[PDB]
């Protein structure tokens, strides 16, 4: 009882380490549950015939006492009947919110596809290499935005997905630079501003540098491909 009252003193005096307060109250309730059993009528006001007013939901003191109550009620089953209705819906809300602070209870109210797909798409591109430059352009664009979507979608495949995606962007950039109409037009002209090839060369060199150094795990097979 007194440990609780000066702990609530500490929480209401320095309202920043309430997270450690809640976790230590949790460990207290888990360590020994049976001590708190007579305090249950006293610590929360549950007037023996009156309708007690609903307690505040996000009040940190009330949260601090509730998490201790639930960690006590982990083992001993003789206090769901002691609970009031606000305690029922508050157990629902606390189990919803703070998943690692309150445990599961028995209250009556509350009773490699990604890697394979990445490999399949990459081998699809590798096999469908031998076709028209235009169709190569649309296939490259489609797979680029696909792998970008996958890198957003997952987390542990995000790096490899983005790495292969920027490699495909590299290849598409070079193929666009080759399919530029500068080669159709005769040599001695080279007018101006059609040098998407030159801008492509600068971007492709920067992307190769980026692809070499910013990534963490690279091995010499990848490195000689980069070079």
């Amino acid at each position: 009882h007194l440990a609780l009252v000066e702990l609530l003193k500490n929480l209401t005096k320095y309202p920043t380490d309430r997270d450690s307060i809640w976790k230590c109250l949790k460990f207290l309730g888990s360590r020994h549950p049976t001590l708190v059993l007579p305090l249950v009528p006293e610590l929360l006001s549950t007037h023996p015939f009156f309708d007690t007013a609903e307690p505040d939901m996000d009040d940190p003191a009330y949260i601090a006492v509730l998490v201790l109550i639930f960690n006590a009620a982990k083992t001993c089953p003789t206090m769901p009947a002691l609970f009031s209705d606000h305690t029922f819906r508050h157990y629902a809300y606390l189990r919803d919110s703070l998943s690692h602070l309150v445990p599961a209870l028995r209250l009556p109210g509350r009773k490699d596809p990604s890697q394979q797909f990445l490999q399949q798409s990459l081998e699809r591109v590798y096999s469908l290499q031998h076709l028209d430059p235009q169709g190569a352009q649309e296939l490259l664009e489609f797979t680029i935005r696909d792998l970008q979507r996958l890198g957003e979608l997952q987390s542990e495949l995000a790096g490899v997905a983005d790495f292969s995606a920027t490699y495909l962007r590299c290849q598409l950039l070079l193929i666009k630079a080759l399919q530029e109409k500068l080669w159709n037009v005769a040599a001695p002209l080279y007018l101006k501003q059609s040098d998407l090839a030159s801008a492509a060369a600068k971007q492709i060199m920067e992307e190769t540098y980026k692809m070499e150094f910013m990534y963490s795990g690279v091995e010499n097979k990848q490195v000689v491909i980069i070079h």
């Binding site: 609780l4 009252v5 609530l8 006293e42 610590l43 929360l44 006001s45 307690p55 505040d56 009040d59 003191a61 009330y62 006492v65």
Partner: peptide, 4 residues
């Protein structure tokens, strides 16, 4: 309660 709000304050024990």
């Amino acid at each position: 309660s709000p304050t024990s």
